[PDB]
Amino acid sequence: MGIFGTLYTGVTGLKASEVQIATTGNNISNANATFYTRQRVVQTTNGYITT
Amino acid sequence: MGIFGTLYTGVTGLKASEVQIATTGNNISNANATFYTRQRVVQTTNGYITT
Amino acid sequence: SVYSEYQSKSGVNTNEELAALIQYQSSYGAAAKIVSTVDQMLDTLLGLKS
Amino acid sequence: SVYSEYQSKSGVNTNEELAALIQYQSSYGAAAKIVSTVDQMLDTLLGLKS
Amino acid sequence: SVYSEYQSKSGVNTNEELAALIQYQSSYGAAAKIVSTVDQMLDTLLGLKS
Amino acid sequence: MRITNKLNFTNSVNNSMGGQSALYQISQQLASGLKIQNSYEDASTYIDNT
């Protein structure tokens, strides 16, 4: 198998969480700014399976 | 001689295992994607050959 | 009033931040376990031919 | 109401689907073992005939 | 803002690096166990020559 | 339910946000010291009030 593809798919899953965390952690860390706002993100998928 | 008979079984399940193992994990990987859903796999009942 | 309606949905709310904070942590964990589970196959894979 | 139909249909419950993944993970390692060992016996017999 | 962004694109992070290193460890181990097979084939050739 | 569990970490906050509204919704009634303050809290009373 070309397992390595599933890895960055797995890593990307962790990438999604960590950035998504960063979105909220920013919100917690930078809540009080005289002005402040929410942010959000979308996810996507890349290649076919090993057919 | 009997090896090529062994070879057939070594092909169908063993190679599919990589795919099935990979795909389901990927489905799990995509589970957090903004819109992912229940995209799943199935077996087929193949022919029978007297030899 | 025009204040209130931006306030109605704009910036930070404890349970919102807390909930997602937990969720991704769990998500970061679910991925870690399975990825290591992938790693265990690398071993099996190698063993197949080793 | 219209939620329950889809999010039922939708999926995403990793613990259970992982379990079968694991036994499949074991599966391919298991077969090759038996396949190879027989082949080794086959190879052994081949050497015997030499 | 500006300091954060460039730092991203630059240096040292296991989450990316280590992931590729684990596979590399397997990558090398597969290489040598592949070489083990040709060694065995080489052993066979030597026996044939004998 | 499977994906609903994703929705449920929201639903926790979603249900919470309902109480979040209520407690303050009381607070302005406490602050106002009145049964109602909006036209649509009870119009029949509201028309009667007017």
E19 in Cβ contact with A15 (< 8 Å): no
Closest Cβ–Cβ partner in A3, A10, A31 for C12: A31
With a CB cutoff of 8 Å and minimum separation 6, the contacts of B26 are A6, A9, A49
Kindly state the tokens that stand for F14.
């979603």
Give dist(CA A5, CA B26) in Å, integer: 10
Instruction: Provide the 8-state DSSP code for F39.
Output: T
Give dist(CA B31, CA B25) in Å, integer: 9
Q: Positive or negative CA dihedral for E36, E38, E40, E42?
A: negative
Q: Compute CA distances C38 → A45, A51, C15, whole Å.
A: 19, 19, 34
Kindly report each contact of residues C6-11 with a partner whose C-beta sits within 8 Å and lies 24 or more positions away, as own/partner: C10/A36, C10/A37, C10/A38, C11/A27, C11/A31, C11/A36, C11/A37, C11/A38
D31 in Cβ contact with B15 (< 8 Å): no
Question: What burial class does residue E6 get, using C-beta atoms within 10 Å of its C-beta: 0-12 exposed, 13-18 middle, 19+ buried?
Answer: exposed
Give dist(CA D28, CA B14) in Å, integer: 5
- Cβ neighbours of D28 in C, within 8 Å: 44-45, 48
D21 in Cβ contact with B24 (< 8 Å): yes
- Summarize chain F as % helix, strand, coil (round to 5): 70, 0, 30
A50 in Cβ contact with B25 (< 8 Å): no
Question: What burial class does residue F5 get, using C-beta atoms within 10 Å of its C-beta: 0-12 exposed, 13-18 middle, 19+ buried?
Answer: middle
Residue in chain C closest to D14 (alpha carbons) equals C30
User: Do chain B and E touch: 3 or more Cβ pairs under 8 angstroms?
Assistant: no
Do the Cβ atoms of A17 and B32 come within 8 Å? yes
Give dist(CA B21, CA D18) in Å, integer: 9
Residue in chain B closest to C36 (alpha carbons) equals B25
Which one, of B2, B7, C17, lies nearest residue D35 by Cα? B7
Kindly state the tokens that stand for A44.
């996507």
Give dist(CA E9, CA C31) in Å, integer: 24
Give dist(CA B28, CA D13) in Å, integer: 8
Kindly state the tokens that stand for C6.
């931006």
Give dist(CA E22, CA C8) in Å, integer: 48
E30 in Cβ contact with C49 (< 8 Å): yes
Q: Compute CA distances C3 → C7, C8, C9, C23, F20, whole Å.
A: 6, 9, 11, 31, 18
Which one, of C40, E21, A12, B27, lies nearest residue D18 by Cα? B27
Give dist(CA A44, CA F7) in Å, integer: 19
F34 in Cβ contact with F44 (< 8 Å): no
Give dist(CA D38, CA D10) in Å, integer: 44
Overall resolution, Å: 6.5
CB-CB neighbours of B22 under 10 Å: 22
Which one, of A29, F4, F3, E16, lies nearest residue C21 by Cα? A29
Task: Give me the phi and psi of F41, to 5 degrees please.
Answer: -75, -45
B24 in Cβ contact with D20 (< 8 Å): yes
- Looking up tokens 């290193």 gives E21
Kindly state the tokens that stand for C9.
């949905």
D7 in Cβ contact with F2 (< 8 Å): yes
Give dist(CA C38, CA D13) in Å, integer: 18
Instruction: Provide the 8-state DSSP code for B47.
Output: -
Kindly state the tokens that stand for D14.
């990793």
With a CB cutoff of 8 Å and minimum separation 6, the contacts of E35 are none
Give dist(CA C26, CA C19) in Å, integer: 11
Do the Cβ atoms of D8 and F5 come within 8 Å? no
Question: What burial class does residue E13 get, using C-beta atoms within 10 Å of its C-beta: 0-12 exposed, 13-18 middle, 19+ buried?
Answer: exposed
Do the Cβ atoms of D4 and F1 come within 8 Å? yes
Closest Cβ–Cβ partner in B14, B21, B31 for D14: B31
C41 in Cβ contact with E25 (< 8 Å): no
D8 in helix, strand or coil?
helix
Query: Would you state the torsion angle of the CA atoms of residues F20, F26, F28, F31, taken in this order, to the nearest 10 degrees?
Result: -130
CB-CB neighbours of A24 under 10 Å: 21
Amino acid, single-letter form, for residue A1: M
Closest Cβ–Cβ partner in B22, B33, B34 for A6: B22
